[PDB]
Amino acid sequence: DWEQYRDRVNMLQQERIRDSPLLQAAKENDLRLLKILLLNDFQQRGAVGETALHVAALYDNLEAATLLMEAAPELAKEPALCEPFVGQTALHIAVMNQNLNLVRALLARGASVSARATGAAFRRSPHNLIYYGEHPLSFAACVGSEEIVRLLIEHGADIRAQDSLGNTVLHILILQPNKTFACQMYNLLLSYDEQSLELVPNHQGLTPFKLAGVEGNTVMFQHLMQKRKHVQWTCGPLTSTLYDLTEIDSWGEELSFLELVVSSKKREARQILEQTPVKELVSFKWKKYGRPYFCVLASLYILYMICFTTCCIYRPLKLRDDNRTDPRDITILQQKLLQEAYVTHQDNIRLVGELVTVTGAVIILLLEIPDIFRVGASRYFGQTILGGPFHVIIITYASLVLLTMVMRLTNMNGEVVPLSFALVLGWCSVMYFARGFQMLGPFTIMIQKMIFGDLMRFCWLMAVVILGFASAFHITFQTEDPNNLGEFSDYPTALFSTFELFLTIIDGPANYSVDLPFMYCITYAAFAIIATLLMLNLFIAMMGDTHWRVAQERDELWRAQVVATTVMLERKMPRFLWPRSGICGYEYGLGDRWFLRVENHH
Amino acid sequence: DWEQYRDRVNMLQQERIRDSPLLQAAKENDLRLLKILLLNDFQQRGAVGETALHVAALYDNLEAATLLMEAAPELAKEPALCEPFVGQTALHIAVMNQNLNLVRALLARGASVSARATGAAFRRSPHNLIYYGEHPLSFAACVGSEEIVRLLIEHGADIRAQDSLGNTVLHILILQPNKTFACQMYNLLLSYDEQSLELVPNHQGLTPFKLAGVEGNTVMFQHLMQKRKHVQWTCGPLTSTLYDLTEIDSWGEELSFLELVVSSKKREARQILEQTPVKELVSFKWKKYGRPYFCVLASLYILYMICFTTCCIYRPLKLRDDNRTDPRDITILQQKLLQEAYVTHQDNIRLVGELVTVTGAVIILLLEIPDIFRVGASRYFGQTILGGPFHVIIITYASLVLLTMVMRLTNMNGEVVPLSFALVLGWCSVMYFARGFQMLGPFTIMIQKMIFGDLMRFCWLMAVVILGFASAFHITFQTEDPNNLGEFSDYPTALFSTFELFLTIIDGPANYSVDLPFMYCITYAAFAIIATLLMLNLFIAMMGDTHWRVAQERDELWRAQVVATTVMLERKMPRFLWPRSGICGYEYGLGDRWFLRVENHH
C-alpha cells in the first residue's frame, strides 16, 4: 500500500541522515563538526537522493546551508532523485519553510526558479495533504509569502508555467484552503501577467474561472467577479451593476460553466449557484423558459403514461383452452396470439396506443443514451442533482417496453411480467418531474435520501428478523393441517406471510374453531413485540430524526436540481425556444459581450 | 450503614473536642487558655484517637500547633488510632490544609514523611469524596502544592512508595479531577525519580499509563504521549511524527492496553480511542485486517444459519398414527423415531447438515466459554461494547441445538420447542455482525438502547392495561355463545387477543349477524382510546424523543464496538493472519521498539 511505502521512505530517509555525518550535521546545525567535515562527498545523498543542502533547508538551518554552499556551490542546482521526491531542489524546501534569507542565498548561487518537483509526493491525490504544483513560485504563492513571490519573479520565474495537471499558479491558488490570502496572492500574480493567464486551460480544459466553479470556491468566484462587473450608477440606497456573462453563460463552449458547476462531485460546487450574477441568471432562465417547458414535458409524459396504461388495461386476452383440473388453479384467461390479437376496431385503436407506447420508448433511449456518453455513466446515474436514479428507471422502463414488443411479435407467453414492472417503473418515473415544483421537489429528495439511507439499514435488520420468525412459524405449523391455518403452509408462503405480518398488512393468523400450537402464541407474542411494536415504530422514530437533520441539505439540493434542469433543457431543446440570456452589448456599443444588469439596495 | 457510622464518628469527634478543654482550645486558637493549660494530658485524645495537635492542624491554627509542639514535641510523631482514621498524622492534615508553615514546623520536629493513613476514610471507595492515597507526598501532589511536594522530597519522602491498592503517587494523580495542574505535578514527580516509576504496576497490574487508559483520562494520556513521540521533520504546514507503540500495542502483554480501554466500565474510557496514535493504530488494524476477517466470519455464520434453517425445513416427520377424535384437533404429522428418520438419500444429506449444525454449536461454546473466564461473567454479558447481549443469545442458541441433538437421540417428542427458539435466537444473533458496517452498526445500538429503555417501560404499563381489559372482555363474553365471538372465550385466549388488539395486529371483534353485549362496545371504545390511540402512538412519540437525545452516544458506542471487534479478532485469530502493526524499529537502528508514523497539517 502507498502509506506503508511513504512510511518506509520517511524511515530510510531519517536513517541515512543519522548514518552519514555530513547529513547529521546538516540536520543539527553544529557548525564545528560541519566545518571539520568540509575542511577534510559534499555530493553525499540521503535515501531519496537529496543532498546535505536539502537536509539543511528541511531543518531550516540557514548557517549550515551557507557553509555547505560555500564548500560546494553546485548543491544549490541539485534535485532529489528517487520516485517520491524526483526533481525537488533545496529552493522548493526553503520556499515551503518561508526562509527568505536561505531563498536569497540559493538564488544568488544559481538555484533554478523553473525546476519542477515531478515526484509523487507533490501531485494532486488523496495520498498527499497539500498540492502546491511543481514550481517554487507555485509553492511561494500557496504558502502565501508575497516577498518570496516577488523575489522569484525578479529572478525570472515563469508565471505562466504549468504543473503536470496543466494547472498554472492561478489554478493552484483556487485549490488552497487559505482563501483569506489566496485572493491577495491572485492579484499579486495578475499584476505580473499584465492571452491573459486567466484564460489558460489545464488538462481538464478548465480555465481558473471554471475551476473556481467546479471546486465550489465561492470566495475566489466572487473575487473574480469584481473584474467582471461595472457599476452603472448609484443613487441614494440603490445601485445598478452590469455583470459580464461571457464565462458564466459559456455560449457555444463545450461543457459550459453551468454544466461544470451542476455536474461537479464537490458538495461545495452548488453554493456557486447562490452567487449574485449566477443566481439571477439561472432564476431568469428558469422563470422565463425552464418552468414553461418543464410543465409541457411533465404534461406530455403523464399523457404518454396514460396511453401506455390504457394499452395494458385493454391488453388482448381470450378464454383459456386447457381445463382447470387442479382445484387450486384460478387462471381463466390466456394471451391472444398475434394473428388473433388484432381483429376488431378496438384492437386497431389499441395498436395506435401501442405504437405511441413503443415510439416513446425509442425516443427515451435516443434522449438518454447520448447523455451517458457526455457525462460518463458513473456520474450520469450517480448524481442526485442531474436525476441519476430516474435515468436508471426510465431506461429500464423503455427496455421493458421494447422487450414486451418482441414478446408480442414472437407469441411469447408471460407479458404480465415486463408490463407489471414497466407500469410500476413508468409511473414512479413521473416523480422525475417533481423537481420543477417547490411543493413536490424537496419532498422527492427526502424520498431518495430515506430510500438509500434509513430504508436500506432497516431492510437489512428486518430481513434477519423475518428469516428467524418465518422459520419458527413454518416448523411450528409443519405438523398441523394446512387447511385450518394456511399462512405458514410452506417456506415461501411463511416468508411472505411473516413479511406481511411484520408490516401489519395481513392480520395475525387465528382460527378460534381449532387448537393452534402453544408454541405459535409464544412465537407470535415475541414477533409482535420485536417486529410491530419495537422495530416498525423505531423506523418512524429514526426517520423523524433523519428528517430534521437533512432538511437544510434537502432544500440546497432542490435549488441545485432546478438549475440542473434549466441547464439540461437549454442544452437539449432547439435554440429558437431558448433566446440567449442577458443583454446584448453590441446595440449599446459594448462590443460582442452579453451582460446581466442587477439593481440592488444598501 | 456506612453513612450512619461516619456521621456518628463525626459527632463523637466534635463532642470530645467540646468536652476536653485542651482540644477545645486547639480548635479555638485562644492562646491565653492554651498557655494556662500547658503551664499547669498533652497526649489527650479525641474520639478517633487524634491528639490536640491533629485538632490544631484540622482547624488550621498555626499558633496553637506551635504551643502544643513546644509543650509536647512527641505529638508531631503521633497517629490517630480508630478505624476511620488509623495512621493519620497532623502532617497529613497540615498538608491537606496547605499550611506550608505548619508542615515545616511538624517536619522540623520529626513528623514522619513515610507515615501511611491506612484508615477507611482515606481508601478508594464510593463512600469517600476524595482519594489521595496514604502518604503525605500523595496528599501534597493531589492538593497541587509544588512547594509542599518539594519540601517533603527534601525531608526524604519516598516518591516510589505505594498505597494499599499498590498505587504510586503517579497512579493517584491520574485519578484526580484537577487535570489542569495534575500534569504539572506529574512532571515535578518524574524529575525526582530521574525501573522508571512510570513502569511500576498497582495491585490490578496497571502501570500509570494503563490506568490513564482504563480511567479515560485523555488529558493525562495525551500528556504521557509527549514523552512517547519524536518529531522527524516539519516542512511548511506539514509535520511527520513517530509515536512509540510499546505500551499502546502491548505486544505479548497479558491484558493489553487496548483490551483494558475497550473493556473498561468507565464511560470516559472510550474517548482514549479518539487520541492520535490510538485512533490511527486501531483504524489501520480495522481497515487492513479487521474488516476483511469480520466480513468472512459474518458470511460463514450466515451460511451456517442457512444450513441449520434447512435442517429445520427438511425436519423428519410422518403421518400421525392416533386419530383426530377431537373436532378442534388439527395435528396430522408426527416426529419420526431415530430408527426411521435416517433411511433415504435426502435423510443422509440432512444428517450432514445436522452434523455441521451440531459442530458449529460445539465450536460456539469452545469460543465463548473461555472468554467468560477472562473478562468475568458480570462484564462479559454486561458490556455493550464487547457484545454482551449477543454472547447471551449465541450461548443460548448453541445450548438449544445441543438439547435438540439429545432429544433426537432419545426419541423425545417436542423438538418444535427448542428449534423454534434456536431459529429465532440463531437468526437474531446475525445482528452481532452489524457492528462491522457503518450503515447497520449505530442502528443496532439504537435497537439495544430502545429494548432495555423505552420498550421495557412501555411493556410494564402496557401489561397493566392488558390485564384490566382482558378481564373485562372475558367476563363480558362468559355469558355469550363461544361459537359467535371466540376471541375472549377463555382467559388465556382473552389475554392473547387483548395483546393483539392493543398492537392492532388482529381486527376488533365484530359479528353483525348477532347482538354482542352493550358492555363490549363501551369497554372496546375505552380500550381503543387508551391502548391504540393514546399509548401505541405515545410509544412512537417517546422513541422519537429518546432517538434525538441518544444519537451522539450511539455513534461513540459504534466506533468503540469497531475497536473492541478489532481487539477481539487480533486476540483470538492465528498470529500469521495478524502481522504486527506499525513500523519495526530494528531495521532503521531504533532498537527493539515499534512505531506509528503520523503525518499531519497545521
Ligand SMILES: CCCCC/C=C/C/C=C\CCCCCCCC(=O)O[C@H](COC(=O)CCCCCCCCCCCCCCC)COP(=O)([O-])OCC[N+](C)(C)C
Ligand atoms: C436491503 C436488504 C436486503 C436483504 C436481502 C435478504 C433477503 C432474504 C429473504 C429471503 C430469501 C429466501 C427466499 C426463499 C428461499 C426458500 C424457498 C424454498 O425453496 O424453500 C425450501 C427449500 O429451501 C429452504 O429450505 C430454505 C433454506 C433457508 C434459506 C433462507 C434464506 C437464505 C438467504 C437469506 C439471506 C441471507 C442474509 C440475510 C441478511 C443477513 C423449499 O421447501 P418448501 O418451503 O417448498 O416446503 C417445506 C419443506 N419440504 C419440502 C420438506 C416440505
Ligand SMILES: CCCCC/C=C/C/C=C\CCCCCCCC(=O)O[C@H](COC(=O)CCCCCCCCCCCCCCC)COP(=O)([O-])OCC[N+](C)(C)C
Ligand atoms: C417487561 C414487562 C413484563 C410484564 C410481565 C407481566 C405479564 C402479565 C401477563 C399475564 C400473566 C398471566 C398469564 C395467564 C394466566 C391465567 C391463565 C389461567 O389459567 O386462567 C384461569 C385461572 O387463572 C385465572 O383465573 C387468572 C387470574 C388472574 C391472573 C392475572 C395475571 C396475574 C399476574 C400478572 C402480572 C402481575 C403484574 C403485572 C404488572 C404490574 C383459567 O380459567 P380459564 O381462562 O381456562 O377459563 C375461564 C374460567 N373458568 C375455568 C371458570 C371457566
Ligand SMILES: CC(C)[C@@H](C)/C=C/[C@@H](C)[C@H]1CC[C@H]2C3=CC=C4C[C@@H](O)CC[C@]4(C)[C@H]3CC[C@]12C
Ligand atoms: C416488483 C417491482 C415492482 C419492484 C422491484 C420495483 C421497484 C420500484 C417500484 C422501486 C425501485 C427503486 C425505487 C426508487 C428509486 C429512486 C427514486 C428516487 C426518489 O427521489 C423518489 C423515489 C424513487 C423514484 C423510487 C421509486 C420506487 C422504485 C422505482
Ligand SMILES: CC(C)[C@@H](C)/C=C/[C@@H](C)[C@H]1CC[C@H]2C3=CC=C4C[C@@H](O)CC[C@]4(C)[C@H]3CC[C@]12C
Ligand atoms: C424485508 C426486506 C429485506 C425486503 C426487501 C424483503 C422481503 C422478502 C421477505 C420478500 C420480497 C419478495 C417476497 C416473495 C416473492 C415471491 C414469492 C413467490 C410466492 O409464490 C411465494 C412467496 C415468495 C417466495 C415471497 C417470499 C418473501 C419475499 C422474498
Ligand SMILES: CC(C)[C@@H](C)/C=C/[C@@H](C)[C@H]1CC[C@H]2C3=CC=C4C[C@@H](O)CC[C@]4(C)[C@H]3CC[C@]12C
Ligand atoms: C418466544 C421466543 C422466540 C422469544 C422469547 C425470543 C426472544 C428473542 C427474539 C429476543 C430476546 C432478546 C432480544 C434481543 C436482545 C438484544 C439485542 C441486541 C440489540 O443490539 C439488537 C437486538 C437484539 C439482538 C434483540 C433481538 C430479539 C431478542 C433476541
Ligand SMILES: CC(C)[C@@H](C)/C=C/[C@@H](C)[C@H]1CC[C@H]2C3=CC=C4C[C@@H](O)CC[C@]4(C)[C@H]3CC[C@]12C
Ligand atoms: C405486554 C407485555 C408485558 C408483553 C411482554 C406480554 C404479553 C402477554 C400478554 C403475552 C405474551 C405471551 C402470551 C401467551 C402465551 C401463550 C399462550 C398459550 C395459548 O394457548 C393461549 C394464550 C397464551 C396464554 C398467551 C397469553 C398472553 C401472553 C402471556
Ligand SMILES: Clc1ccc(CO[C@H](Cn2ccnc2)c2ccc(Cl)cc2Cl)cc1
Ligand atoms: Cl410525482 C409528480 C411529479 C410531477 C407532477 C406535476 O404536477 C403538476 C401539478 N402540480 C403539482 C404540484 N404543483 C403543481 C401537473 C399535474 C398533472 C399534469 Cl397532467 C401536469 C402537471 Cl405539470 C405531479 C406529481
Ligand SMILES: Clc1ccc(CO[C@H](Cn2ccnc2)c2ccc(Cl)cc2Cl)cc1
Ligand atoms: Cl443484521 C445484519 C448483520 C450483518 C450483515 C452483513 O451484511 C453484509 C452486507 N452489508 C450490509 C450492509 N453493508 C453490507 C453481508 C450480507 C450477506 C452476507 Cl452472506 C455477508 C455479508 Cl458480510 C447483515 C445484516
